[PDB]
């Protein structure tokens, strides 16, 4: 895939620096269009960053900050759109790279960057950085007033080499010959927003951005608005003319391209767009395919459980005792769940009591989270996450720190117990620094994820080779060695049969306590009135008409405890009176009343 999420962690120091770069790597490996912000922060000196080399286009901002690395290989980046801005002003922010052989970014090397659509540039405190003052930023900007939002520090600890002798007019992104700045705006003819040269015939189509290779709207280096299968357009496709032409029907607007159908975890709108959140007056219906769609409520919209980052909890940063009751009986939360140290310690500033462990019971019904699950603190009483026993999907439509849909850190649970979890819609999982936690690598994460660009990042849990004995590794009866915790009630898939929650070797088909039939690998009880059979099948189903033989009397076709004595199967039906045989089959009574009948007959009717 070419389109990937950004991050949203700004200048915050990494939650686990051990696996921070791995996060970045998985996130951007192969990615071309970053649907969000490109944040390259806190990168060590030797850092291998070749996974960035396909990034062509960024929607949000680009933030390169707090790095000791000498260069970030972003040579193919053509356009940042600035749909979101750093510090609400900047589309490109290069901050604090290197301390106040030596560490720090030396060159920018954004050799292809020829369009910043919105916001300015902020470059500050980079003691090793050269050539940033060289660039004619005006050209890159879409409008000139973006110059008024630009601050470029040139304080520097080293002398810079000149631009390559092969450089046009002393403007470059680095010492290389292919590092010269390519001007596509200020160097143009007549009208022309972008040109490939100074002649009128070198103008790019009205609909290009960054530049072009020719005059047609298919020669664009970037689309100003929308990419319709290699053609830049103002809109995603009411007809006026009496005909039909090629280029398929109508499309959904997803990011800055028109696409046939919305990508995996998104939602199609009536307005004709893809989204991770529906508008007001709108539900969310699942098609038989699994496809999701926002649509207007026919009645007044029914009750909806909003999690964090949604509705009244949009500012609220964690599940506390103040809002825990809001999730009572919720099968599906629209938003995220976050449990922080402050959840269980309880903020003593506000009159908010520390949340007690048994209050987490509210989540027992929970099956779906649209946002993310984040657990950085958990009660020391609880050995596992069994309160989330029934959670099936975490969509990850909202990702914690813009990257993780499931984070478990610093917990000291011994096992997971998330035994219904079958899907992580999108985003990465992070499970780190849980010193007691086993059963992390007995989970088939490959099957929980959807796209193959997501992964589990793990470090400083209980060592894998130390999860070996009983109560520390999967039970014998777990199929393919997969489980969420210890014992035959924690298997992902069941090797043999299930009796309720438990994996069992055999059902009691031929021998045992109460006899059983099997149905879809499930042990299920015969009817009490079935007669257990010697080494043979006792029953075929749960109903009393499915016995091989009756334990007491038989009342065609049922095995009964006693023969009917004045029962009426319903109103308006006359009562049914019966008596047993020498064999045991219930027999109908004769002439009505006087001798109301039973075995040897009784009066009183």
């Amino acid at each position, epitope marked *: 895939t070419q389109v990937c999420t950004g991050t949203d962690m700004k200048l915050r120091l990494p939650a686990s620096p051990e696996t921070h770069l791995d996060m970045l790597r998985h996130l951007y490996q192969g990615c071309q269009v970053v649907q969000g912000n490109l944040e390259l922060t806190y990168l060590p000196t030797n850092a291998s960053l070749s996974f960035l080399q396909d990034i062509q286009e960024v929607q949000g901002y680009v933030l390169i900050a707090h790095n000791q690395v000498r260069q970030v290989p972003l040579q193919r980046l053509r356009i940042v759109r600035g749909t979101q801005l750093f510090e609400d002003n900047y589309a490109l922010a290069v901050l604090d790279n290197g301390d106040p052989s030596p560490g720090g970014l030396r060159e920018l090397q954004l050799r292809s960057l020829t369009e910043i659509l919105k916001g300015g540039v902020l470059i500050q405190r980079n003691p090793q950085l050269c050539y940033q003052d060289t660039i004619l930023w005006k050209d890159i900007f879409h409008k000139n007033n973006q110059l008024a939002l630009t601050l470029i520090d040139t304080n520097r600890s080293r002398a810079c080499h000149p631009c390559s002798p092969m450089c046009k007019g002393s403007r470059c992104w680095g010492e290389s010959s292919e590092d010269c700045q390519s001007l596509t705006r200020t160097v143009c003819a007549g009208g022309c927003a972008r040109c490939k040269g100074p002649l009128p015939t070198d103008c790019c189509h009205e609909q290009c951005a960054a530049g072009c290779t020719g005059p047609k709207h298919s020669d664009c280096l970037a689309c100003l608005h929308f990419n319709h299968s290699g053609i830049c357009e103002l809109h995603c496709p009411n007809t006026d003319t009496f005909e039909s032409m090629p280029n398929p029907e109508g499309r959904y607007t997803f990011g800055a391209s028109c696409v046939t159908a919305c990508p995996y975890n998104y939602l199609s709108t009536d307005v004709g767009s893809c989204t991770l959140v529906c508008p007001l007056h709108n539900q969310e219906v699942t098609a038989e395919d699994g496809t999701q769609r926002c649509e207007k409520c026919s009645k007044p919209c029914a009750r909806v459980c909003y999690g964090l980052g949604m509705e009244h909890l949009r500012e609220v940063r964690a599940v506390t005792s103040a809002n825990i009751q809001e999730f009572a009986g919720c099968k599906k939360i629209f938003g995220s769940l976050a449990f922080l140290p402050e959840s269980f310690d309880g903020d003593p500033a506000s009159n908010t009591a520390p949340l007690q*462990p048994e209050q987490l*019971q509210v989540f027992e019904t929970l099956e779906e989270i649209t946002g993310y699950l984040y657990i950085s603190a958990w009660p020391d*009483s609880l*050995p596992d996450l069994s309160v989330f026993q029934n959670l099936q999907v975490i969509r990850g439509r909202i990702l914690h720190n813009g990257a993780y849909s499931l984070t478990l850190q610093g917990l000291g649970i011994s*096992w997971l*117990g998330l035994r219904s979890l079958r899907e992580l819609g999108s985003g990465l999982a992070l499970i780190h620094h849980n*010193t007691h936690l086993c059963f992390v690598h007995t989970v088939p994460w490959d099957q929980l994820f959807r796209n193959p660009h997501q992964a589990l990042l793990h470090t400083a849990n209980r060592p894998e080779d130390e999860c070996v*004995g009983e*109560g520390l590794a999967c039970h014998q009866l777990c199929a393919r060695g997969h489980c969420w915790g210890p*014992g035959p009630t924690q298997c992902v898939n069941c090797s043999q049969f299930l009796r309720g929650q438990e994996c069992v070797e055999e059902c009691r088909v031929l021998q045992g306590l109460p006899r059983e039939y099997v149905n879809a690998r499930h042990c299920l009880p015969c009817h009490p009135e079935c007669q257990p059979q010697n080494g043979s099948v006792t029953c075929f189903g749960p109903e009393a008409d499915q016995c091989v033989a009756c334990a007491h009397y038989k009342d065609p076709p049922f095995c009964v405890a006693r023969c009917p004595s004045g029962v009426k199967p319903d109103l308006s039906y006359m009562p049914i009176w019966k008596f047993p045989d020498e064999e045991g089959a219930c027999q109908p009574c004769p002439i009505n009343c006087t001798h109301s009948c039973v075995d040897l007959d009784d009066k009183g009717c």
Partner: antibody, heavy 117, light 108 residues
Framework: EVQLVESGGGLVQPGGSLRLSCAAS????????IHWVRQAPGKGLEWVAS????????SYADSVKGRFTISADTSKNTAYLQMNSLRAEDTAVYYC??????????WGQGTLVTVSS | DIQMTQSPSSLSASVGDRVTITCRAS??????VAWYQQKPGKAPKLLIY???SLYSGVPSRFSGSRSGTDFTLTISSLQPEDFATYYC?????????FGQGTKVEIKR
């Protein structure tokens, strides 16, 4: 405020059975991790069985496996220890405790089971 | 299984003395060790958990240190109510296991 009040001890004939209760207040037994520990007169502490009722994981010491059944009723907020086919060396003071951090913080008072004729 | 071994079996000390009790794991048991104080015929009381950390409400006298597989419950200055049997317990391997106990007696 967190308490474990256990009961059910007393006298049983060899080969007979007995069930021990461990009623909790201040916390849910279901989500917790309950452990049984015994102490024969003038002996060390001996682990017997355990239960994580929510997860369903039950564990027994080789010493009592096949004779003892650990269980919990959620509504009563109580853990039980069913003991079958009791013998002389089962005579002890049985405690129930709650797992915490990686220790047992709250203990029951301990009930005395005596196996005699 | 895994063996917790305490030393000494018994010790006698006067009021104010620095009592130390050793507990030795047979294999690496990580930091996952607990210390209990049991007065005759009552429930064990938790003193130290996770080798070093002491439980709430426990007096300043009781401390715990780990060196490899050698764990040391140490009472800085003994007091007359400290007469009990002390047990270590490991949590790393399953099932969890206790030490055989150390009986501490008061000299006067």
């Amino acid at each position: 405020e967190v308490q474990l009040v256990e009961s059910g001890g007393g006298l049983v004939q060899p080969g007979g059975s007995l069930r021990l209760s461990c009623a909790a207040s201040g916390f849910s037994i279901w989500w917790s991790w309950i452990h049984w520990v015994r102490q024969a007169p003038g002996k060390g502490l001996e682990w017997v069985a355990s239960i994580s009722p929510s997860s369903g994981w039950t564990s027994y010491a080789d010493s009592v496996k096949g004779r003892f059944t650990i269980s919990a009723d959620t509504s009563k907020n109580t853990a039980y220890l069913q003991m079958n086919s009791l013998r002389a060396e089962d005579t002890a003071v049985y405690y129930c405790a709650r797992w915490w951090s990686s220790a047992m913080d709250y203990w029951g008072q301990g009930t005395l089971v005596t196996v005699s004729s | 299984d895994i063996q917790m071994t305490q030393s000494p079996s018994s010790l006698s000390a006067s009021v104010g003395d620095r009592v130390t009790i050793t507990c030795r794991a047979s294999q690496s048991v990580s930091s996952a060790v607990a210390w209990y104080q049991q007065k005759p015929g009552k429930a064990p009381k938790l003193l130290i958990y996770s080798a070093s950390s002491l439980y709430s409400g426990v007096p300043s006298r009781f401390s715990g240190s780990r060196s490899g597989t050698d764990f040391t419950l140490t009472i800085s200055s003994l007091q007359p109510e400290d007469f009990a049997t002390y047990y270590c317990q490991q949590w790393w391997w399953w099932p969890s296991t206790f030490g055989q106990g150390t009986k501490v007696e008061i000299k006067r």
